[PDB]
Amino acid sequence: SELKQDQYWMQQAIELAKRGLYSTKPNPNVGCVIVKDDQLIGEGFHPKAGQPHAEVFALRQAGEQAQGATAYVTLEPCAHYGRTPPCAEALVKAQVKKVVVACPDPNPLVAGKGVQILKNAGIEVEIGICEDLAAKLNQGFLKAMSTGMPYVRLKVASSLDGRTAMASGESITGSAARQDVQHWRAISGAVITGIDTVIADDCQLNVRSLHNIDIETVAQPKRVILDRRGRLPLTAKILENPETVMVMGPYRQELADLGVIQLEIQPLKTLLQTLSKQYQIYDVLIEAGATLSSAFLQEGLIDEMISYVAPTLLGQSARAMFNADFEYMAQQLRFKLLDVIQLDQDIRLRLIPT
Amino acid sequence: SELKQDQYWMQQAIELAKRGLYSTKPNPNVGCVIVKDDQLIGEGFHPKAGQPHAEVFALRQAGEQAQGATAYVTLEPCAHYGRTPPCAEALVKAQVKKVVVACPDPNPLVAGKGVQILKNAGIEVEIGICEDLAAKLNQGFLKAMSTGMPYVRLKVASSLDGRTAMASGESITGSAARQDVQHWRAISGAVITGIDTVIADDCQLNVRSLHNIDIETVAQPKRVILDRRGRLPLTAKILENPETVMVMGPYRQELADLGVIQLEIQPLKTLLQTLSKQYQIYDVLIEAGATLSSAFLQEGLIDEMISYVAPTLLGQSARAMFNADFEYMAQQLRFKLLDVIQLDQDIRLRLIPT
């Protein structure tokens, strides 16, 4: 089947795209393979902002044999000049016979323009092959470019009885869960937390450990601290790397002098739009306490909740994970369960609102 | 390997034992295969109290060819007369060459006596083959016979935030979890609940639905209701089948006239010992509210907790699953996680105290 061969090669391209997962932000993960007479002649992936696009690497490998070949690309070749020349033009120049595209461009202001340039040159273009699987490569980018809002993941860690701490915030989950969290942080443009967490935990919320990846190649998440009374202590550990920190609160000259980006107090929905529009942050991880976590949930600002549950009971006086006060069952916040996995002694659920 | 062949056949016997899982109580699940010249000549399992033991069925099949053969039995052949003749004597009579035993007898007053009868006849006896796997056939019976206390499973159903109901007991988990609970009920000699649950839910706590098993062959759990003020309404659904009901509370002639077994108010640990010693109940399922469930937990009376968690948030005013008031993290009740599975939209954890 010609469809199944197209799917076979696009799946190779989707695999290449994953080599950049942690280093591409704000740019999309993109793979590309070039195939001729059923033979692979060029592979490429986008490693990092400012570096060449996937198609460019793949063509450099393919060389002159790219003429008459088929290019499989997980995303629509670009039609504009920025830090690099446009990919649609490179494919034309290489005189490929056919370009197969998984996802069209999510930005409505440019969508279809790359394909159009291919149509004009007489290049065969078919679109939609393994689109579902390719979309999983770019949940944040695709959402942010099509709607102006980032993809938001809420992380929570609790006991079996749904508690996050004793009455006084003494603290559940183990090292396997901690390692898993590294992955979620490393695909995020920002980790959002509240001042309460920073004061209680003195956390860094950064990426320090990943499987099969050198941490120096990681594009680190910005640490976004919601601090409405401007209480962030200057000695906080989260401030050792100040240029990757943003504080939402009353303007403090101490913070500006350190290079910390300061945001005016704004509604959570507006905050998310700001991060996407002004700061190119398309994947957000929330790592916060009950109050801030519940605010995001109740305002309907969560795309996915990642819940770590530890095999322990903390009792009815320990801190509730979700602090809404509901009366009737009809008010419950129901989610669709995607999956559950075991992480040593903990478990992790992934959940999508309904 | 002679060990691996012994293991191969014992595993066939362990499999046969499972055919009686739901109908054997209070008797143990027991399988038996008879093998000669590497050929299976007889299989047997114990189906139900009063019926022949596994070895008897297997020998009836083996017939005269049982002479010189090897018998694999998941539990030590009995050495005493009750409702049936003793199995040790049947094997001798059949003139088997060798008897392979997984689990020795758990009752210390009779342990080794069956083996002794085999030793005396010159019959080869080796013991311990796939013991771990065979023990899983009889968690309750083996515990109760060796210690006088039943194996106790605590079932709980909660939201992700560890809640069981709204402030007023309005009620989470779905049909897949409900079906799973049927299995746990069907291996139990008793389901224990409190009056609060009976009043709120009007539950039956019986077995009505099982995979690949006719419900008429099931030996139903007794429904044990803890009712210290004697409030059980005579119109309660749990009372439609009164002879399988036990109430712990102040004596009521209304209940005796219906045939309900009445227990005097006693401590929970004493209650469990009573059920085992006086009523031959070796596997207990607790299906109760927060108060009674927490009492069992805090008194250290739980062997295993089976926790069903639904993908929903009920909020901080909904009923806590565990009502202890702890202050420090050191007071937490920690469990070892055995496994987690997905049940459609819910999950189930199995947990063992530490």
Ligand SMILES: Nc1nc2c(ncn2[C@@H]2O[C@@H](COP(=O)(O)O)[C@@H](O)[C@H]2O)c(=O)[nH]1
């Ligand atoms: N690559 C990767 N994926 C992880 C990790 N931890 C959890 N996951 C998630 O768990 C798997 C679930 O499959 P999915 O349905 O998301 O494709 C992965 O796809 C990924 O989303 C991790 O450490 N590395």
Ligand SMILES: Nc1nc2c(ncn2[C@@H]2O[C@@H](COP(=O)(O)O)[C@@H](O)[C@H]2O)c(=O)[nH]1
């Ligand atoms: N046979 C059976 N086992 C179940 C069912 N639901 C849960 N289980 C448990 O889940 C599996 C876990 O394997 P185990 O470690 O207990 O041998 C089974 O062994 C059994 O204990 C059920 O409906 N039928």
Ligand SMILES: Nc1nc2c(ncn2[C@@H]2O[C@H](COP(=O)(O)O)[C@@H](O)[C@H]2O)c(=O)[nH]1
């Ligand atoms: N903890 C915390 N909650 C916030 C913050 N900003 C907004 N919220 C909560 O989000 C909800 C809606 O407020 P808005 O997002 O419209 O400002 C309110 O319940 C508010 O308390 C914040 O910076 N920190």
Ligand SMILES: Nc1nc2c(ncn2[C@@H]2O[C@H](COP(=O)(O)O)[C@@H](O)[C@H]2O)c(=O)[nH]1
């Ligand atoms: N809800 C409930 N709790 C009980 C019952 N029997 C004992 N408990 C609880 O178990 C704990 C120890 O009491 P004991 O088991 O020594 O009578 C106490 O906290 C007590 O309230 C009962 O029948 N129902």
Ligand SMILES: O=C([O-])C(=O)[O-]
């Ligand atoms: O990033 C690269 O080096 C590539 O795609 O070859």
Ligand SMILES: O=C([O-])C(=O)[O-]
């Ligand atoms: O600092 C606070 O209290 C806040 O952010 O709301």
Ligand SMILES: O=C([O-])C(=O)[O-]
């Ligand atoms: O129970 C039976 O009928 C058996 O074991 O053959």
Ligand SMILES: O=C([O-])C(=O)[O-]
């Ligand atoms: O009925 C009650 O309140 C009880 O059992 O404790």
Ligand SMILES: C[As](C)(=O)[O-]
């Ligand atoms: C598919 As592209 C964003 O590398 O032109």
Ligand SMILES: C[As](C)(=O)[O-]
């Ligand atoms: C192993 As038996 C209890 O059937 O004698």
Ligand SMILES: [Cl-]
């Ligand atoms: Cl916080």
Ligand SMILES: [Cl-]
């Ligand atoms: Cl109860």
Ligand SMILES: [Zn+2]
């Ligand atoms: Zn491009």
Ligand SMILES: [Zn+2]
């Ligand atoms: Zn017997």
